[PDB]
Design an enzyme around this catalytic site. Structure first.
Site, PDB file in Angstrom:
ATOM      1  N   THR A 171     151.564  18.711 -66.008  1.00 49.35           N
ATOM      2  CA  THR A 171     151.870  18.889 -67.363  1.00 49.35           C
ATOM      3  C   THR A 171     151.446  20.360 -67.779  1.00 49.35           C
ATOM      4  O   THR A 171     150.184  20.728 -67.706  1.00 49.35           O
ATOM      5  CB  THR A 171     151.245  17.846 -68.163  1.00 49.35           C
ATOM      6  OG1 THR A 171     151.587  17.994 -69.501  1.00 49.35           O
ATOM      7  CG2 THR A 171     149.721  17.498 -67.791  1.00 49.35           C
ATOM      8  N   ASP A 175     161.696  17.441 -67.032  1.00 49.92           N
ATOM      9  CA  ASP A 175     162.845  17.363 -68.206  1.00 49.92           C
ATOM     10  C   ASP A 175     163.448  18.905 -68.168  1.00 49.92           C
ATOM     11  O   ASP A 175     164.334  19.140 -68.860  1.00 49.92           O
ATOM     12  CB  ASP A 175     162.467  16.771 -69.336  1.00 49.92           C
ATOM     13  CG  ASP A 175     161.281  17.502 -69.915  1.00 49.92           C
ATOM     14  OD1 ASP A 175     160.404  18.001 -69.651  1.00 49.92           O
ATOM     15  OD2 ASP A 175     161.519  17.396 -71.493  1.00 49.92           O
ATOM     16  N   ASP A 225     137.226 -23.101 -69.741  1.00 44.29           N
ATOM     17  CA  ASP A 225     136.585 -24.412 -69.069  1.00 44.29           C
ATOM     18  C   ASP A 225     134.756 -24.192 -69.337  1.00 44.29           C
ATOM     19  O   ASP A 225     134.673 -24.179 -70.729  1.00 44.29           O
ATOM     20  CB  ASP A 225     136.593 -23.768 -67.525  1.00 44.29           C
ATOM     21  CG  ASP A 225     136.063 -24.944 -66.585  1.00 44.29           C
ATOM     22  OD1 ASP A 225     134.856 -25.021 -66.131  1.00 44.29           O
ATOM     23  OD2 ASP A 225     136.864 -26.024 -66.569  1.00 44.29           O
ATOM     24  N   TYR A 282     126.549 -29.115 -65.086  1.00 40.90           N
ATOM     25  CA  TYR A 282     127.140 -30.324 -65.068  1.00 40.90           C
ATOM     26  C   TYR A 282     126.055 -31.418 -65.172  1.00 40.90           C
ATOM     27  O   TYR A 282     126.473 -32.420 -65.350  1.00 40.90           O
ATOM     28  CB  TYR A 282     128.141 -30.684 -63.884  1.00 40.90           C
ATOM     29  CG  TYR A 282     129.373 -30.117 -63.779  1.00 40.90           C
ATOM     30  CD1 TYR A 282     130.546 -30.618 -64.504  1.00 40.90           C
ATOM     31  CD2 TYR A 282     129.586 -28.776 -63.175  1.00 40.90           C
ATOM     32  CE1 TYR A 282     131.703 -29.941 -64.516  1.00 40.90           C
ATOM     33  CE2 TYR A 282     130.816 -28.220 -63.045  1.00 40.90           C
ATOM     34  CZ  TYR A 282     131.793 -28.867 -63.754  1.00 40.90           C
ATOM     35  OH  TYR A 282     133.365 -28.440 -63.789  1.00 40.90           O
ATOM     36  N   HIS A 325     145.461 -24.845 -64.746  1.00 42.51           N
ATOM     37  CA  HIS A 325     143.992 -24.645 -65.347  1.00 42.51           C
ATOM     38  C   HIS A 325     143.675 -23.512 -65.271  1.00 42.51           C
ATOM     39  O   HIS A 325     142.641 -23.235 -66.103  1.00 42.51           O
ATOM     40  CB  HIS A 325     143.211 -25.579 -64.338  1.00 42.51           C
ATOM     41  CG  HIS A 325     141.676 -25.704 -64.634  1.00 42.51           C
ATOM     42  ND1 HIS A 325     140.958 -26.193 -65.670  1.00 42.51           N
ATOM     43  CD2 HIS A 325     140.573 -25.109 -64.089  1.00 42.51           C
ATOM     44  CE1 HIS A 325     139.830 -25.955 -65.799  1.00 42.51           C
ATOM     45  NE2 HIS A 325     139.541 -25.105 -64.607  1.00 42.51           N
TER      46      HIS A 325
HETATM   47  O1  S0K Z   1     127.058 -31.596 -70.624  1.00 43.21           O
HETATM   48  C1  S0K Z   1     128.297 -31.984 -70.856  1.00 43.21           C
HETATM   49  N1  S0K Z   1     128.929 -31.830 -71.975  1.00 43.21           N
HETATM   50  C2  S0K Z   1     128.651 -31.164 -72.988  1.00 43.21           C
HETATM   51  C3  S0K Z   1     128.306 -29.900 -73.026  1.00 43.21           C
HETATM   52  C4  S0K Z   1     127.621 -29.339 -74.049  1.00 43.21           C
HETATM   53  C5  S0K Z   1     127.632 -29.854 -75.277  1.00 43.21           C
HETATM   54  C6  S0K Z   1     127.736 -31.128 -75.506  1.00 43.21           C
HETATM   55  C7  S0K Z   1     128.158 -31.799 -74.322  1.00 43.21           C
HETATM   56  N2  S0K Z   1     128.523 -33.203 -74.641  1.00 43.21           N
HETATM   57  C8  S0K Z   1     129.211 -33.508 -75.753  1.00 43.21           C
HETATM   58  C9  S0K Z   1     129.613 -34.894 -75.772  1.00 43.21           C
HETATM   59  O2  S0K Z   1     128.775 -35.639 -75.192  1.00 43.21           O
HETATM   60  C10 S0K Z   1     128.233 -35.471 -73.864  1.00 43.21           C
HETATM   61  C11 S0K Z   1     127.784 -34.262 -73.888  1.00 43.21           C
HETATM   62  C12 S0K Z   1     129.088 -32.478 -69.737  1.00 43.21           C
HETATM   63  C13 S0K Z   1     130.288 -32.942 -69.746  1.00 43.21           C
HETATM   64  C14 S0K Z   1     130.744 -33.490 -68.425  1.00 43.21           C
HETATM   65  S1  S0K Z   1     129.404 -33.501 -67.504  1.00 43.21           S
HETATM   66  C15 S0K Z   1     128.410 -32.612 -68.440  1.00 43.21           C
HETATM   67 MG    MG Z   2     158.467  18.415 -70.233  1.00 43.91          MG
END
Ligand code: S0K
Ligand code: MG
Ligand code: S0K
Ligand code: MG
Lengths: 546, 546
Positions: free
Chosen positions: B122, B184, B334, B465, B523
């Site tokens: 350019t 061009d 998630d 979890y 998901h």
């Molecule tokens: O930690 C978990 N959930 C969670 C996470 C954060 C705040 C509240 C919650 N919940 C609110 C509703 O009551 C259960 C705890 C959970 C879900 C499936 S395996 C562990």
């Molecule tokens: Mg030009």
């Protein structure tokens, strides 16, 4: 005996208090004295205000509850609320009105420095108002100064309930007679006093501080002006960009707002900006403090031409591209000062505004070989010493503590003349083995630089000096341009190398150049006069880069 | 035979061309045809415009030179310029007017993808106008798509001079018959053609593209819609914050503007946001894409409670404090979706706006033990499988390629049912050793995740979890609150676990909730429908977080 200090927020670290506004609003509006406060407090421990302060409800949820407490309270006193009466309005105004009470922060600051555990203990709320950001800022600025911040709404308890105090004692890891607590409300002191805490009913700040000086045996009041906040390396967000495959730049990053990229000099570090970084973040800027190519955690390739100004420039442009910044404010000192001028000349599209500390912009002379130019001024002799690879490295690497303790000195503290350094055969020849510590720096700070320079030493840094031919030829391509972007020059009165008069003609090439000057300031501008530097940059940023 | 493609900017990658405006301005103003262009071109190789394009002068310096060429040209044609005539004005308007010609970018894009070396070539200028940022943005967006960008003003040469072409050939490391050049202006093609380059005079885009398809043998025109730009890990600014002494968070950071903090899910990475990161930066945001506690380059302490929602939350707040951000937009998917809702509930002061992909906000039930709650829906069985430390780690760590190639699949491509996973005794029991590659991901992308998870594996991630009791008890403290900050929910039609109906009542607790929905999306929302996701977030950001 005392080991902890605890400060209330409203009415103590922050003024005017918001009960302050409730008092005034009634008078303004000629309502029955105390009516607004009866609303606020309606229902005692089970009322709308307590649930707010415990965090059961948010502030947006409590507003229309207070409204009702304001209807009920007025029915019962037999008076009508004004058409347009607004609880949201009163509180918005009250909250934005409150500022940090500076002298209380500084008294807390000093107590931390003398080794106290400090905390803030406050009844406050989960704020979800559109305008919540104002107070989030204020709290952010406050908390970074304290060991703990305890909020009624976060912990589900309130002053005066006696359980918050137990939690307090428990958080401080200390007993009730090792603690002083200052609060503007007599009732909150009541229970602290029972467990045997020293307390201080806080009316006017000065008296409070007198009581506090009297109870701790530390001078708080009338004390000299404190340094600006510094940065503790390991609490910083550290960033890394590969600008080309052998070469990564490291930086420390604080604040939000327009990007401000700080470029240190030789032989320095991002840390050289330690006193500006919090100040500018706090002023509403996104500070990016580099380790310049060759230093600290940036890479340090050995080759001389890796450090010519052209390549240094291209790589700073690459650093923006990879960070996704179209522009940044470039602020430089010493070698970084030279770099930002050339950024302005070669990439004005990428520079929002340019500023240099100590380093003037003097256009290359196309009719004088660049070595001749340097040799024509005795004060630059150390530059020729830097030429022959190996020599300066050997000396500067030989004792790192000594090196920085020798260089990092104020204008009256000098221990080496930049004078006939070739002939004398070293930069340290008639200077001490163990210098005394400059008033500008603590032992720890020198140790930081020492530890950084142990990654690569001085080859990289010194190479910045080893491209005069190349840089001269490159610079000559810009001789027709002027610098017409926003631009600040800051001269340092007692920098005996990069002297102020050197900057005299800069207007010829930068016609809208703004200036600052700092008196009684040596070469290490940022750390020598950190207060004046911040104030000059913040004022120029707000007006010219905003 | 052809190996390189070179695109002019003005009139090729960017439209309307600025000669475009000179033509119109004369007509608008009823000036002698071509007069404005005679000014522009006055003096040929030694005139004001050539010196600009070589970079001898800046654009602010040339403006008043063009003015003069506009006085002289009109004197000689015997006509008077309009009162208020403004060169700065015309050009400002012309420059802001030009946009990226999307179909040309996509044709260049595809040629790079088929392995061509691409470049932009350019004639342009060192822009120092107050408004220079507009074009810097545009150039930034363009260059990240090309191997080289050659600018007349950067290299001190111009089209048509035959030396820029030599420099071009030299930069491409290729000979003049391996190169196609589109421009061009007939004159610029003239010399390329001599050294034997294929050329394409570019009038309308479609014809140009036909010629280009015809000369390269690659389909460019009418091609399906391309994915959004992705991120190459090693070209990213990577950031690190210690939030407490055993624990650092890592993130990737792009763009400027309000802070947007992206929180990935299980078992993912900052990379899960690879298609949103450039889009949002480009939309004017500062994107911060986390590795969430437990993943990638963030630390992964082993203890279960290090991952309860409370601690995860406090540590994200700490991450803001240490970065100096009072607020950020929190976007989650998630597990990160759960996290951002609780950020909104527990720290509304620190959340500018909140959004979740797939993950609904469903308040804890205070009268039902939390395990019972999970067990009451067959689709969550894999959650109970995750409970017993060791078991899921063993399986998920056993073959990393298989693990991600099994999980990261579209809705019609499934190879494991989330169904009776306890009874079957594994998440992979009746699924293949070597799955086929999902259409959503390339082999390389899976290898990225594989390489990340080899730092810590799944203990950290799975621990998210393993705090239901604790998280339930914590969540119950918020049952009185509502979420009254700005808030978006985006449901994914064919997510069979986090199904759309689950979100049905959210209005009860978030009364101003805005919604998006994506059809035919499983998901892994971000990578499944990256185009729709970006569009939904960018529209909600501009209206609700701006
Ligand atoms: O930690 C978990 N959930 C969670 C996470 C954060 C705040 C509240 C919650 N919940 C609110 C509703 O009551 C259960 C705890 C959970 C879900 C499936 S395996 C562990
Ligand atoms: Mg030009
Ligand atoms: O590289 C040096 N200076 C420099 C740096 C960057 C651009 C131009 C220059 N100058 C412009 C003036 O002419 C000489 C080169 C230098 C100075 C003392 S030791 C090496
Ligand atoms: Mg108070």
């Amino acid at each position: 005996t005392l080991r902890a200090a605890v400060f209330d927020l409203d009415g103590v670290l922050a003024l005017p208090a918001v009960f302050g506004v409730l008092g005034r609003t009634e008078e303004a509006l000629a309502l029955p004295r105390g009516l607004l406060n009866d609303a606020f407090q309606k229902g005692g421990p089970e009322g709308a205000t307590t649930r707010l302060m415990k965090g059961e409800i948010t502030l947006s949820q409590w507003i229309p509850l207070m409204e009702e407490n304001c209807r009920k309270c007025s029915e019962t006193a037999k008076v009508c609320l004004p058409k347009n009466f607004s609880i949201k309005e009163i509180f918005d105004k009250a909250i934005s009105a409150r500022k940090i009470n500076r002298p209380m922060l500084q008294a807390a600051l000093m107590l931390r420095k003398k080794g106290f555990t400090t905390a803030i203990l406050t009844n406050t709320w989960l704020d979800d108002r559109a305008e919540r950001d104002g107070l989030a800022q204020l709290m952010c600025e406050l908390k970074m100064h304290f060991d703990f911040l305890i909020e009624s709404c976060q912990v589900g308890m309130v002053k005066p309930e006696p359980q918050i105090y137990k939690f307090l004692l428990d958080t401080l890891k200390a007993s009730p007679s090792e603690v002083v607590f200052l609060d503007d409300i007599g009732a909150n002191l009541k229970p602290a006093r029972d467990l045997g805490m020293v307390t201080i009913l806080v009316q006017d700040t000065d008296t409070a501080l007198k009581e506090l000086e009297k109870v701790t045996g530390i001078q708080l009041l009338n004390t000299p002006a404190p340094l600006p906040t510094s940065c503790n390396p390991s609490d910083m967000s550290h960033g890394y960009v590969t600008v080309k495959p052998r070469v990564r730049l490291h930086f420390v990053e604080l604040g939000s707002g327009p990007a401000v990229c700080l470029c240190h000099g030789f032989p320095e570090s991002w840390y050289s900006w330690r006193y500006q970084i919090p100040a500018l973040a706090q002023a509403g800027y996104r500070v990016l403090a580099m380790d310049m190519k060759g230093y600290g955690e940036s890479s340090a390739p050995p080759e001389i031409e890796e450090y010519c100004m052209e390549v240094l420039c291209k790589e700073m442009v690459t650093f923006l591209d990879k960070l996704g910044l179209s522009q940044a404010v470039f602020i430089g000192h010493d070698w970084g000062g030279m770099l930002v001028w050339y950024m302005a000349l070669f990439y004005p599209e990428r520079v929002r505004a340019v500023a240099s500390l100590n380093t003037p912009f003097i256009p290359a002379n196309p009719n004088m070989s660049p070595l001749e130019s340097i040799k024509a001024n005795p004060v630059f002799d150390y530059q020729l010493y830097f030429q022959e690879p190996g020599v300066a490295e050997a000396e500067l690497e030989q004792n790192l503590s000594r090196t920085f303790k020798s260089l990092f000195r104020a204008s009256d503290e000098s221990v080496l003349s930049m004078h006939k350094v070739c002939e004398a055969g070293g930069l340290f020849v008639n200077s001490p083995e163990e210098p005394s510590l400059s008033r500008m720096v603590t032992e720890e700070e020198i140790q930081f630089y020492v530890q950084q320079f142990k990654k690569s030493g001085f080859r990289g840094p010194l190479n910045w000096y080893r491209n005069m031919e190349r840089n001269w030829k490159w610079a000559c391509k810009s001789l027709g341009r002027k610098i017409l972007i926003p631009a600040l020059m800051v001269t340092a009165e007692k920098d005996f190398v990069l002297v102020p008069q050197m900057s005299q003609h800069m207007e010829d090439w930068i016609p809208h150049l703004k200036r600052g000057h700092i008196e009684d300031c040596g070469h290490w501008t940022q750390m020598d006069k950190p207060t004046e530097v911040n104030q000059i940059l913040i004022k120029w940023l707000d007006s010219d880069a905003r």
